[PDB]
């Protein structure tokens, strides 16, 4: 799990 | 218009047959030089009901869906996507958090299997050499091709003619 993988996962979720 | 008929005719056996008759056409369209014509009748395609979930366009995700699709149809639904792409970039209305390719779809994305795929690898070979090295694969799936959002920002790409 990368930071890119994680700032996308914030992202969509948010 | 008489080619607009006899598609229009042709879009009543289904989708089902609807689907491979636009890959065969577009296959030959794009290995016969006719790279304009192809890029019409996707577009004309697109608008009939045929390949719905060819492009996604929204904040988070500008997607191109090409697992269901030809060589030869990818290829020409990648030039019409990066000649979309470049479009923006000359207006301020901001830009999505991502760009992917979605080359294979299914159990293959959670393993390496898929990184040979003859798709992935014509997606990932026809992105390098048009774009350069701008769209990578992705760290936590095996069928998709990405770009970041600053990767877009130093991003008429494709050049369509007909022979």
């Keep these: 799990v990368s930071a890119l993988e994680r ?8 | 218009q008489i080619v607009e008929y006899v598609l229009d005719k042709l879009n009543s056996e289904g989708c089902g047959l609807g689907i491979r008759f636009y890959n065969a056409l577009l296959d030959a369209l794009w290995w016969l030089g006719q790279k304009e014509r ?16 060819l492009f996604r366009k929204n904040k988070l995700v ?33 830009l999505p958090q991502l760009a992917v390719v979605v080359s294979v779809r299914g159990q293959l994305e959670k393993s390496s299997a898929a990184r040979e795929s003859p798709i992935t690898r014509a997606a990932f070979s026809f992105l390098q050499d048009h774009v350069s090295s701008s ?3 992705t760290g936590w799936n095996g069928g998709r091709i990405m770009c970041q959002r600053s990767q877009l920002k130093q991003l008429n790409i494709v050049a369509l003619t007909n022979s």
Excluded at chain 2, 81 to 94: A, F, R, T, Y
Aim: proline share 2%; no cysteine; net charge negative.
């Design chain 1, 7 to 14: 700032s996308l996962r914030l992202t969509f979720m948010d």
């Design chain 2, 38 to 53: 192809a890029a019409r009748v996707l577009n004309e395609a697109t608008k009939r009901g045929i390949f719905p979930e």
């Design chain 2, 62 to 94: 500008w997607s191109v869906d090409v697992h269901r699709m030809s060589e030869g149809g990818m290829y020409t639904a990648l030039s019409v996507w990066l000649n979309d792409l470049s479009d923006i970039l000359v207006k301020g209305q901001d």
């Design chain 2, 135 to 137: 769209f990578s694969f």
